[PDB]
Write a protein that binds this ligand. Structure first.
Ligand SMILES: Nc1ncnc2c1ncn2[C@@H]1O[C@H](COP(=O)(O)O)[C@@H](OP(=O)(O)O)[C@H]1O
Ligand SMILES: COc1cc(C=O)ccc1O
Length: 336
């Protein structure tokens, strides 16, 4: 029994959201007291997601979006499969590390547009319909240790995750970097279909009117679990600064041991210079059927901490600073 309320967004704000975000064509929902924001298909799959059966030897990466999930997934997958770079190259990351809730963002009306554009390639159409189905099925079939990506906040996780004491890597990135990256993602992915500019998109981000917001609640619930035996909390920013330390810390958490030389190999493999040319971690399967707008910046983009952003303005930076102070006041959360 899915225990939290699901309410369509107030109708006038829901209308504006439908005008700016063309990947959704029914409406947006807010979930529970915290008003967790999602497209209409959350109402439809809530029960499936909540009752999804975790296993004790699952490895879960939970993050707010564009907080360093893909980087972390590749690191973790290799650490838990004897650094098997060959298999990592030949199986896509989305197959090795399935995205639990991706299917929420594949609307019927929008899937009709993908199918029309691929309507001559039966395999391309079988792939597109599969994107519409919960990953949870293929995952339940698996008889090997599983790797699961989610942006579901702690409080919206399948309860079997903590019940089974499965391992969770929670990664947090700073709001400024997340806002700019998230905007690019919303323009890149036709499943989102965002048309407006960064100023408009930041205003939606600040009002928690983007998928998986409230951002600050997502981070607080993360931080609140970081003392648990089965949780590892890390800042993207520290992971960028000291890879050898990140890899070794992550390996220790998962109960794995590797030589200075294996860590060195992993540093080369996970450097952005090599990673952005890596077949298995760029979304080649998705770009092949036209789900990605090719024009935009790429799912593996820059990977910088507080790097140059043309989109960012003094007025947005000052609001981001204020929004940071109202939310982090009387907590010990500090981005490095
Ligand atoms: N090998 C790597 N090193 C550092 N950052 C990486 C990386 N691969 C991907 N990223 C960055 O992680 C962010 C996306 O995170 P996620 O996987 O959670 O969507 C993007 O941020 P930018 O758009 O700031 O470059 C992306 O470029
Ligand atoms: C491939 O990763 C993602 C895809 C989407 C598409 O709507 C949203 C969030 C993600 O993290």
């Amino acid at each position: 029994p899915f225990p939290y309320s699901i309410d369509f967004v107030e109708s006038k704000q829901n209308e504006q959201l439908l005008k700016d975000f063309h990947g959704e064509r029914t409406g947006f929902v807010q979930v529970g007291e915290k008003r967790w924001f999602f497209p209409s298909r959350f109402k439809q799959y809530a029960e499936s997601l909540y009752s999804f059966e975790a296993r004790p030897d699952d490895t879960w990466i939970v993050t707010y979006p564009r907080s360093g999930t893909t980087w972390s997934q590749e690191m973790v997958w290799l650490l838990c499969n004897e650094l098997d770079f060959e298999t990592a190259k030949s199986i896509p990351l989305t197959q090795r590390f399935p995205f639990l809730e991706f299917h929420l963002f594949v609307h019927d009306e929008v899937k009709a547009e993908f199918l029309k554009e691929n309507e001559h390639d039966v395999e391309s159409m079988k792939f597109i319909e599969q994107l519409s189905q919960p990953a949870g099925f293929m995952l339940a079939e698996m008889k090997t240790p599983r790797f699961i990506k989610t942006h579901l906040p702690i409080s919206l996780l399948p309860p079997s995750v903590f019940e089974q004491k499965a391992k969770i890597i929670y990664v947090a990135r700073n709001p400024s970097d997340v806002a700019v990256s998230y905007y690019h993602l919303n323009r890149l992915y036709r499943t989102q279909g965002y048309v407006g500019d960064f100023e408009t998109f930041y205003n939606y981000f600040e009002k928690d009117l983007t998928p998986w917001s409230p951002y600050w609640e997502h981070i607080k619930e993360g931080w609140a679990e970081r003392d648990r035996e089965n949780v590892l909390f890390m800042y993207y920013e520290d992971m960028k600064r000291n890879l050898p330390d990140t890899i070794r810390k992550t390996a220790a958490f998962l109960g794995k041991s590797f030589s200075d030389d294996q860590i060195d190999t992993m540093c080369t493999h996970l450097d952005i210079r090599n990673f952005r040319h890596n077949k298995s971690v760029t979304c080649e399967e998705l770009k092949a059927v036209g789900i990605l707008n090719s024009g935009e910046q790429g799912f593996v983009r820059n990977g910088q901490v507080r790097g140059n952003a043309e989109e960012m303005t003094d007025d947005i930076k000052r609001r981001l600073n204020e929004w940071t102070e109202r939310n982090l006041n009387g907590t010990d959360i500090r981005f490095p």
